[PDB]
Design an enzyme around this catalytic site. Sequence first.
Site, PDB file in Angstrom:
ATOM      1  N   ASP A 122      -1.271  91.427  75.280  1.00 30.86           N
ATOM      2  CA  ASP A 122      -1.033  92.891  75.518  1.00 30.86           C
ATOM      3  C   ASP A 122       0.422  93.255  75.453  1.00 30.86           C
ATOM      4  O   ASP A 122       0.760  94.365  75.032  1.00 30.86           O
ATOM      5  CB  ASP A 122      -1.593  93.303  76.884  1.00 30.86           C
ATOM      6  N   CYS A 126      -2.034  98.857  63.742  1.00 30.22           N
ATOM      7  CA  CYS A 126      -2.159  98.485  65.121  1.00 30.22           C
ATOM      8  C   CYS A 126      -2.435  99.804  65.912  1.00 30.22           C
ATOM      9  O   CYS A 126      -3.464 100.426  65.579  1.00 30.22           O
ATOM     10  CB  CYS A 126      -0.966  97.638  65.623  1.00 30.22           C
TER      11      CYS A 126
END
EC number: 3.1.3.48
Length: 504
Positions: free
Chosen positions: A399, A433
Amino acid sequence: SRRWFHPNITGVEAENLLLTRGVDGSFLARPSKSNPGDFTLSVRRNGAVTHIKIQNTGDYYDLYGGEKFATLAELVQYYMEHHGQLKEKNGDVIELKYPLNCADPTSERWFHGHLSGKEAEKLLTEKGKHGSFLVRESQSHPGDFVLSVRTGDDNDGKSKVTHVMIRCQELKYDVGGGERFDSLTDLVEHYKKNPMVETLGTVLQLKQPLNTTRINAAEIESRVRELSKGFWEEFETLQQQECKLLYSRKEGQRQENKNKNRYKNILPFDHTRVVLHDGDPNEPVSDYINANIIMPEKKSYIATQGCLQNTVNDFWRMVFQENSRVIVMTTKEVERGKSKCVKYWPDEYALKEYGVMRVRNVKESAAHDYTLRELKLSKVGQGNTERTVWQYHFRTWPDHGVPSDPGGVLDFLEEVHHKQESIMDAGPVVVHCSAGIGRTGTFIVIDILIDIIREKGVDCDIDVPKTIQMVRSQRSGMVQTEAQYRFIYMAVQHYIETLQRRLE
Ligand SMILES: Nc1ccnc2c1N=C(C(=O)Nc1cccnc1)C2
């Protein structure tokens, strides 16, 4: 100004600079050397200094109490034009008016610091060209500098190196007479515009800095060893060059397009944006998607953001128009409880329409780091337009930060490369992304570098920062962090070594 970033200043030094050399509205930006991806915008307001935090974990620069940005240069440009927009916690407006310039030459490509005249001559002889130059410290005269410049034709005496002493007297720089400069940058810039002329007529043209970053690919392990001390400084020098890339993004700024951007200030360059044709005649602006063509300078890429609910149809229009046959997704749909990309594909075995486009999810295949979805895309009413689009969804990227080993990424990219290579006349590979600059830029730059090695073998030249700069000229902020920069070197190192071990 291109010198508002101070790489080696502490917070105290920044306060004292703004209090002694600035006025209200004065500002500078600086890193934290202790913390990954933390930066500070230090601003003078009412005779006191405020420090505003900017964080980057890999996706964008997030300015506390402001907006998200692709680069610090874009952040500074935005706020210098938009007064009233940068605010304190209590709502008080912080004005960015007067960049406070940095004299530190270490962000400049031409600065080599500790380096002899014999070493500078050998580097300029071996790698340099007419007008290649560098500045180094004096070894004879402590505290002074030398400018060394190759002039010539293209070893028969047709070219030479000239050394020009630069005195430092009371924190100003000069070449023995005339102007005294407040930094080496000001001196070099002056003599780039007004070149020195020798008594007998040679013009000491400062055409390009000496290149120190191009390496032979088989030498990668020793470059990485040297940079692992070195990466920080090489990345700073690359980052300085973003000030050359403030290209227009007017289309992304139009009212009609504002809500097609995931982040209002992370926008595609007009000159490389993907223009969508054949749009709905009833939709006044139907040509816009937050996406850019990236052409290396054999595949090309489209770098784009994660879909929003209102851009899924535009995404499929793009894929269809550009004849793209491979999509690379490098986020989960949700990370830290926040949506990074809407699900723009059907459930396995399901068929959905997305405006004029129809997509069937034929089959999903799960691997350890990724899921592959075999999608079939067609225009509604035109069955013979069907083509397979292979969506490679990388699912294990952390993350924050980057993977600790590049193996998963390299196996994934090999597979993506081979799929693309197997389809005759396939269009650009779509890579996305969240904002489409950090992870997206990292995957694209790794792919470009490995592609050179894949074709030319282990004995070819590569230049990581030059390749990144080239991609950054086509979409804002491609490759966001020093951790991603190191990861690119690591991935290329791991790729090279796996070829060498096949030969054993
Ligand atoms: N010298 C610069 C001019 C403009 N914009 C930036 C500059 N440097 C930046 C930067 O992010 N530097 C950096 C270094 C080392 C590690 N991480 C970041 C960003």
